[PDB]
Each structure stands twice: as structure tokens, then as C-alpha cells.
Amino acid sequence: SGAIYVGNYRVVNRHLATHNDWANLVWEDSSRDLLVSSTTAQGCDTIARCDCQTGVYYCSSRRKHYPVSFSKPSLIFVEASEYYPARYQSHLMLAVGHSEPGDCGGILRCQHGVVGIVSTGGNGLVGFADVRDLLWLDE
Ligand SMILES: CCS(=O)(=O)NCc1ccc2c(c1)OCO2
Ligand SMILES: CCS(=O)(=O)NCc1ccc2c(c1)OCO2
Ligand SMILES: CCS(=O)(=O)NCc1ccc2c(c1)OCO2
Ligand SMILES: [Zn+2]
């Protein structure tokens, strides 16, 4: 689990979005595994605006943050899960690291702020759904 809170927006994994997230839907992209809902309380997170390829992510299944090198956001095939069919996920970044399903929503951060959230894993890789292209999150 995990979300990003910026302005009046809550960013979550689309597959973990709650009934209240869907009741307050602003934007969703199935191909990206993202959903943004509206919040009443102001959020304090800053979104990174950069092309960093190094950062730190929170891994709940290890109660640890790991530093990682990650690929630029791209269209990658993701094996079917208990939340998705075997499909092509867009705006996805991969690193070598530990990820289990429950690690989804872990934040990946660089010096500029939030880069993305854990979205995929397995085979010793962790996949992060990029948010740095969603400029509207900061207006
Ligand atoms: C992540 C597990 S969950 O059960 O809390 N949310 C999934 C969900 C399923 C159907 C929905 C919905 C939300 O909102 C509209 O219809
Ligand atoms: C030295 C072994 S490693 O390279 O596999 N450690 C992970 C790592 C990845 C990116 C980093 C970093 C550490 O610190 C700065 O950026
Ligand atoms: C084959 C195992 S599975 O059917 O549960 N889905 C793959 C998976 C593994 C690790 C994850 C993940 C999804 O999302 C975050 O880290
Ligand atoms: Zn950065």
C-alpha cells in the first residue's frame, strides 16, 4: 500500500484504489496502473520534475529503503498478476531490487522529490509507475 499526497490530489496504484478513490475520481490510466482522486486536506509531497535515473524507494516487505538505478519510463510487458492480465504497462521504470505485491505504493524519491510508486515486481526486479510527466499534479 501507499500513496502520494500533493495539493488536493491523492495518487495511488489503480489496482489498490478504494471505493472512496473511485467516488472522488480525477484521472485514471489502466495502462499505467495509476489513479488520482481529489482530497479535501492539502497534500505536502513535492513531485520530482527531472530525468534522474537514481533514487531511493521504500520496500514494505523488508521495512527498508533501498537506493536504486532505474530505467527511463517506457512500455514494458508485465506478467499477469492477481490484479491484472499479462499486458503492456506504460510509463514504467525498472530497477534490480526486491518487490512483492504488497510493496505497491512504496514511493521512489530523488533529490527533486517523488519520482513514482512501486507498481510491479518479481524475478528480482521492481517496477515503478512514473508520475514526473503529470505536470497538472502541481497546479
Ligand atoms: C483494492 C481493493 S478494494 O476492493 O478496496 N477496491 C477495488 C474496487 C473494486 C470495484 C469498485 C471500486 C473499487 O470502486 C468502484 O467499484
Ligand atoms: C554498490 C552496489 S549497488 O550499486 O548495487 N547499490 C545500489 C545503489 C544504486 C544506486 C545508487 C546507490 C546504490 O547509491 C547511489 O545511487
Ligand atoms: C507472479 C506473482 S503475482 O501474480 O502475485 N504478481 C507479480 C508481482 C510480483 C511482485 C510485485 C508485484 C507483482 O507488484 C509489486 O511487486
Ligand atoms: Zn530527480
Q: Which of 31, 32, 4, 36 is nearest to 17 (CA)?
A: 36
Q: Is the CB of 68 under 6 A from ligand 2?
A: yes
In the sheet with 64-69, reading across from the earlier edge strand, the strands are: 64-69, 54-59, 107-110, 113-122, 125-130, 87-96, 74-78
Q: Is 112 annotated as a binding residue?
A: yes
Per-domain residue ranges of the chain: 3-44, 45-139
Resolution (A): 1.4
Question: 107 C-alpha to center of ligand 4: Å?
Answer: 13
Which ligand is closest to the CA of 95, given by its number? 2
Q: Is 65 annotated as a binding residue?
A: no
DSSP 38: E
Cell numbers standing for residue 42: 492539502
DSSP 106: P
Q: How far apart are CA 10 and CA 25, in angstroms?
A: 10
